Structure 1
Amino acid sequence: TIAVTGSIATDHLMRFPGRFSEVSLSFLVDDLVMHRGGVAGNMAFAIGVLGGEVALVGAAGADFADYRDWLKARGVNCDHVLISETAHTARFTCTTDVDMAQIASFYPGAMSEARNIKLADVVSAIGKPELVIIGANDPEAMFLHTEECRKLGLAFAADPSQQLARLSGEEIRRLVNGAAYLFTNDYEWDLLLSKTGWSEADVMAQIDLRVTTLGPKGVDLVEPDGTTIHVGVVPETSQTDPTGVGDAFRAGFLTGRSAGLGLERSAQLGSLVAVLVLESTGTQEWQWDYEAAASRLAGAYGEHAAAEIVAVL
């Protein structure tokens, strides 16, 4: 059972049929759609679709009913979503240009109440989770979640992503120590190092595994002893929107890990889910086709890897 903590949101996604090369910026967009989102919602949805046991742990508004149904239909346990008395579910508004560059605004709303969520209640309700993802969230919620994981003996994955630029060096440091996984992208890895003052070795001495996504260059899985697995991307055919691609990779990778797959196979599955999200507009708008999944995995990584991956799904 994987407990996913992080933002729950509605994503208002727009497409600008140009390049962000323009203060009074005005972008004439040719698409506007509203989808389910938030990093925790995305990851929980992806884990549920892939057949994993997952519980969403975040803060939303009373408007969450439909979202809840949508997630429960995919096996996600939403019993422990905090419902705000007053605030609306967070909203992410984003414009993506032809180069997949993005200009976005995030209104937290009910997200600010995630700091009132208590993992002790979740553990008493569902047992101790096999892993807790500490994703982008209310900052205080992120810190309290990590500290409660440490105190209750729960393995956790530090996944600060969008919040890394808004946290101080000390805050980021408090999020990293003891993590079973550390997820960032390459730019975020450099930023984490610069802000915390830690060296690469300093970080690796405190975590069990570093996972660094590299956009089109794939992903690196680095162990504390330097052992590095590089997994290339599942090449894309219909690139459309980058929102939620990292969440998708994390969900696929952690589902594979929970299914007993090795690091490389789990990262290959994560790459598949990531490209499926890249090729759709919303973050949870992708479909799971077992045969197309097997085919694309085999094309990218070989028949043996594809077969071993699809066997556990």
Structure 2
Amino acid sequence: MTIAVTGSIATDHLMRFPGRFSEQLLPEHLHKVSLSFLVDDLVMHRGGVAGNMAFAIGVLGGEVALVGAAGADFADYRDWLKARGVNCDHVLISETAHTARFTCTTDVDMAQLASFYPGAMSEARNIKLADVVSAIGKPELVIIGANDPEAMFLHTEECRKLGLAFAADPSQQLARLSGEEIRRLVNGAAYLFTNDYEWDLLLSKTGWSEADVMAQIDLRVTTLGPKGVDLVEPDGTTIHVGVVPETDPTGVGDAFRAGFLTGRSAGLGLERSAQLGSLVAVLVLESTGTQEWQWDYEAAASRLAGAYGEHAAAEIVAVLA
């Protein structure tokens, strides 16, 4: 039932370059760069990893508290989440620093070009998850969402000190972190999320075998883009699940992990809960921006059934009923 989404809160300002990035990269002097793109659209959208997720879990119908640091501009955002059932009492409002900001430009192809201002996100090292357990008691899961580095350890350290289930989700910081640090985020993980490119990367940097990784966690999940995802237990069960058929980029990843874990945390099986991830990923990918999408019992039904069976569908919709 109750999962607390520990991670980042941002506003996300996104643009679109209707040409192609390469065609300016190709001739440019890549040591003293002077890059400039003419964009034809600009959106501001509520974002952040821990907030795309909270909203997902909440809209899906489950219990979620948001644990992430933030600024004072954060009243519009807070009331936004609290209105759908997110419990924002545990967000840390900064005294000196604005809510983190994510700026991204995407092109026709669509390569990504981006900056990240952390703002108050760095203070998420000053939060104790105890004071949470106090307020609402000991959650079923603390998700260690991509965040401020030191927070991410502390929030992983503190789960282990309190016997709390966590779900490693280190996507963003694999690139930026060591083998040692990375492994110190993946010990006792009740879950581990990654794409396979990252999971390779992970294996190189950490120096572990796939095996002893699997000793230490209880369930690797690994999303494969247009293929699907591979959920895989230490006992080799390797349930595979394809996608609802796309036909956006940002958010999707966190959106799979939201439906999956809400579908999990309403008693559904690995597979069904994975089928539910795939539905919410694609609800995003078809929505203006990340978190201006609509949950609909009817829609989901008559669509969960196209990609998986009518057997498949009924159950997820039962449990979300």
**Residues 39, 247 of structure 1: 8 Å contact kept:** yes
Q: CA RMSD in A?
A: 1.3
Further displaced range: 54-63 or 282-291: 282-291
Further displaced range: 259-268 or 24-33: 24-33
SS of the residue aligned with 2:37? strand
1:237-277 deviation digits (Å, cap 9, x = unpaired): xxx91101010000000000111000000000000000111
Query: Which blocks of at least 5 consecutive residues in structure 2 are unaligned?
Result: 23-31
Deviation at 1:182, TM superposition (A): 0.1
Deviation at 1:100, TM superposition (A): 3.5
Deviation at 1:27, TM superposition (A): 1.7
**Residues 9, 91 of structure 1: 8 Å contact kept:** yes
Residue 49, structure 1, aligned to residue 50, structure 2: no
Further displaced range: 300-309 or 277-286: 277-286
Further displaced range: 264-273 or 194-203: 194-203
Q: Within 5 Å, which residues of 2 pair with 1:177-196? A: 177-196=187-206
Moved segments of 4+, more than 6 Å? none
Give the whole-Å Cα distance in 2 for the aligned partners of 1:284 and 1:145: 25
**Residues 245, 275 of structure 1: 8 Å contact kept:** yes
Further displaced range: 200-209 or 282-291: 282-291
What residue number does 2:262 align with? Answer: 255
Give the whole-Å Cα distance in 2 for the aligned partners of 1:267 and 1:186: 16
Give the whole-Å Cα distance in 2 for the aligned partners of 1:183 and 1:29: 33
**Residues 248, 274 of structure 1: 8 Å contact kept:** yes
SS of the residue aligned with 2:288? coil
SS of the residue aligned with 1:69? helix
Further displaced range: 96-105 or 201-210: 96-105
Further displaced range: 286-295 or 175-184: 286-295
Percent identity for Structure 1 against Structure 2: 99
SS of the residue aligned with 2:147? coil
1:130-165 deviation digits (Å, cap 9, x = unpaired): 000001001000000001000000010001111111
Deviation at 1:67, TM superposition (A): 0.3
Normalising by structure 2, what TM-score?
0.94
Deviation at 1:96, TM superposition (A): 1.5
1:178-201 deviation digits (Å, cap 9, x = unpaired): 000000111111111111111111
SS of the residue aligned with 1:12? strand
**Residues 80, 122 of structure 1: 8 Å contact kept:** yes
Query: Which blocks of at least 5 consecutive residues in structure 1 are unaligned?
Result: none
Deviation at 1:280, TM superposition (A): 2.1
Give the whole-Å Cα distance in 2 for the aligned partners of 1:218 and 1:17: 29
1:91-129 deviation digits (Å, cap 9, x = unpaired): 000112222321111110100000001100000000000
What residue number does 2:15 align with? Answer: 14
Normalising by structure 1, what TM-score?
0.97
Give the whole-Å Cα distance in 2 for the aligned partners of 1:12 and 1:216: 26
**Residues 60, 84 of structure 1: 8 Å contact kept:** yes
Larger Rg: 2
**Residues 258 and 153 from structure 1, CA distance in 2 versus in 1: closer, same or farther, beyond 3 angstroms?**
same
**Residues 218 and 18 from structure 1, CA distance in 2 versus in 1: closer, same or farther, beyond 3 angstroms?**
farther
Give the whole-Å Cα distance in 1 for the aligned partners of 2:119 and 2:318: 41
Give the whole-Å Cα distance in 1 for the aligned partners of 2:109 and 2:211: 34
